[PDB]
Amino acid sequence: SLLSLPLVGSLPFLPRHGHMHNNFFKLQKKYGPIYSVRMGTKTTVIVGHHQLAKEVLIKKGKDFSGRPQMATLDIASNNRKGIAFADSGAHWQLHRRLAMATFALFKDGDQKLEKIICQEISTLCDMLATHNGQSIDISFPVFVAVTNVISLICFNTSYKNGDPELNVIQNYNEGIIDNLSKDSLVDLVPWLKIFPNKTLEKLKSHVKIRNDLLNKILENYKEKFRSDSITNMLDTLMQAKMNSDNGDQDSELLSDNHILTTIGDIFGAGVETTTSVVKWTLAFLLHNPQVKKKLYEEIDQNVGFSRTPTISDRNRLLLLEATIREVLRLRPVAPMLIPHKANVDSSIGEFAVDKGTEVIINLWALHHNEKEWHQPDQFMPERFLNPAGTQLISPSVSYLPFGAGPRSCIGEILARQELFLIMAWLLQRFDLEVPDDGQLPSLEGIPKVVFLIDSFKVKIKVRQAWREAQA
Numbered sequence: 001s002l003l004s005l006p007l008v009g010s011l012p013f014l015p016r017h018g019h020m021h022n023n024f025f026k027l028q029k030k031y032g033p034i035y036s037v038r039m040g041t042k043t044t045v046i047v048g049h050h051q052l053a054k055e056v057l058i059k060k061g062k063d064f065s066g067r068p069q070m071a072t073l074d075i076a077s078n079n080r081k082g083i084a085f086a087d088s089g090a091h092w093q094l095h096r097r098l099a100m101a102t103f104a105l106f107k108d109g110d111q112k113l114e115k116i117i118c119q120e121i122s123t124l125c126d127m128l129a130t131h132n133g134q135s136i137d138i139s140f141p142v143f144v145a146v147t148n149v150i151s152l153i154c155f156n157t158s159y160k161n162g163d164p165e166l167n168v169i170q171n172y173n174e175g176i177i178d179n180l181s182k183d184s185l186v187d188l189v190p191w192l193k194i195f196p197n198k199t200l201e202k203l204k205s206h207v208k209i210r211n212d213l214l215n216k217i218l219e220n221y222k223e224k225f226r227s228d229s230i231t232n233m234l235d236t237l238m239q240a241k242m243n244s245d246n247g248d249q250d251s252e253l254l255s256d257n258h259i260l261t262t263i264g265d266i267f268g269a270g271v272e273t274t275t276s277v278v279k280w281t282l283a284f285l286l287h288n289p290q291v292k293k294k295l296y297e298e299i300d301q302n303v304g305f306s307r308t309p310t311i312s313d314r315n316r317l318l319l320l321e322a323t324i325r326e327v328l329r330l331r332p333v334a335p336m337l338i339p340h341k342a343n344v345d346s347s348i349g350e351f352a353v354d355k356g357t358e359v360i361i362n363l364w365a366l367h368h369n370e371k372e373w374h375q376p377d378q379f380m381p382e383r384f385l386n387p388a389g390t391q392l393i394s395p396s397v398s399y400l401p402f403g404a405g406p407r408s409c410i411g412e413i414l415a416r417q418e419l420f421l422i423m424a425w426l427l428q429r430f431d432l433e434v435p436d437d438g439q440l441p442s443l444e445g446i447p448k449v450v451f452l453i454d455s456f457k458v459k460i461k462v463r464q465a466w467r468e469a470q471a
């Protein structure tokens with residue numbers, strides 16, 4: 001006969017305890033695969049089942065193609081310009097399309113995507129080779145390689161080794177990622193509006209520096225540019241721009257700031273995602289020597305040492321394809337994609353969703369659904385193979401590492417080639433070992449905009465059999 005306390009507020013688990021994406025997924029046992037939390041005025045819906053997710057992303061994909069406002073995203077996107085963090089509409093549709101259309105200047109020519117990639121991988125391998133017998137962090141050499149790839153695709157410039165501008169990019173990259181969100185993007189409680197903090201101030205200084213740096217390349221490129229040379233991304237965007245004076249409906253959408261941010265998004269997305277996945281891949285091979293050995297045998301049997309690996313090679317290095325697929329399952333780069341938002345009054349699984357409501361797909365939930373996968377916690381590349389190991393299969397519909405629909409990733413083709421190639425070249429040539437202290441990388445992860453792995457070292461060695469075939 002004692003009374004319930006008045007309740008001003010309720011949350012279903014602790015903030016800043018454990019990973020968000022896993023917290024949400026544990027909740028699916030009591031509350032089912034779809035539920036909502038209310039923050040002040042803002043309502044957020046979380047979706048943990050492939051069918052409900054495919055509804056959000058494909059079937060009613062335009063209804064949910066929105067992105068919410070966040071004070072952090074604002075600053076990194078110079079107030080919702082660019083692609084990723086721009087809302088649905090005029091500006092987004094064009095720049096998305098333009099960047100997608102650029103991926104075609106590399107279908108097959110002097111600058112075939114596979115060539116640009118390989119030349120930068122050749123360099124990575126030569127730099128790696130001098131560290132023969134040593135334990136190292138590979139984060140930066142890889143970062144360089146994929147920075148040059150993304151540079152070549154953007155500007156047709158790359159950097160010489162030792163170019164200081166690389167270390168500057170690295171610094172502001174680490175900064176922006178660090179301050180963009182504490183953990184995940186999805187912030188149950190908005191602490192940054194509650195307690196005095198320096199977070200937005202920090203982030204403006206890093207982005208100011210990124211902006212300064214891309215502004216230099218932009219002005220200076222105005223000289224090189226010619227309307228009868230479309231070889232790279234800035235040319236796609238400037239060609240579209242002077243295609244906006246007739247007697248101009250697309251000129252407002254392509255100011256220098258709009259162009260800045262778009263390149264920024266591609267420059268960033270291009271570097272940080274794939275470096276993380278490479279780091280994640282080595283980490284998994286270090287914990288799984290049996291898979292590593294079977295990767296050596298496969299590359300030996302099928303490529304051998306007579307030449308260097310090729311895009312065509314994905315048709316015979318099947319276990320390598322399956323490993324990548326399984327790193328993308330088990331540690332998805334974006335475990336909750338990026339937040340969607342209802343453009344209009346709509347529904348999911350026939351529940352009402354109001355215009356402007358935040359919608360998150362829990363990719364991690366999909367990728368660990370125990371009804372959809374055998375032993376979802378486990379690193380099992382075999383799961384993407386038929387039992388005899390002679391062909392790739394799709395064991396589950398509950399698999400969307402690159403998302404789906406209108407907000408899907410535009411960099412999948414680039415990402416996929418890059419990752420297979422980097423891993424292929426690295427295996428052909430290097431023994432990759434636990435460094436001389438028995439320290440194995442933690443596989444827990446660090447959720448930010450990208451799902452990162454704690455930094456770690458590998459003992460790098462030139463392969464017996466690679467030196468053999470050098471006589």
Ligand code: HEM
Nearest residue numbers: 083084269270273333337338401402403407409410411415
């Ligand atoms: C391992 C590599 C990658 C993975 C797993 C990945 C996955 C994703 C996912 C899951 C999304 C968001 C889907 C959503 O919000 O519903 C996304 C968005 C995006 N990705 Fe990637 N991505 C990768 C690499 C790349 C690369 C290399 C690029 C560079 C060209 C890139 C460019 C973008 C852009 C611009 C968006 C925003 C799309 C939009 O809002 O319209 N991504 N990606």
Ligand SMILES: C[C@]12CC[C@H](O)CC1=CC[C@@H]1[C@@H]2CC[C@]2(C)C(n3cnc4ccccc43)=CC[C@@H]12
Nearest residue numbers: 084172173176264265268269272333334449450
């Ligand atoms: C913050 C950062 C990376 C560091 C840079 O200094 C600033 C920057 C620019 C745009 C961001 C990018 C990281 C990844 C983002 C968010 C991204 N993106 C593209 N594919 C992704 C897959 C998973 C997570 C993010 C993904 C699209 C635009 C990208």
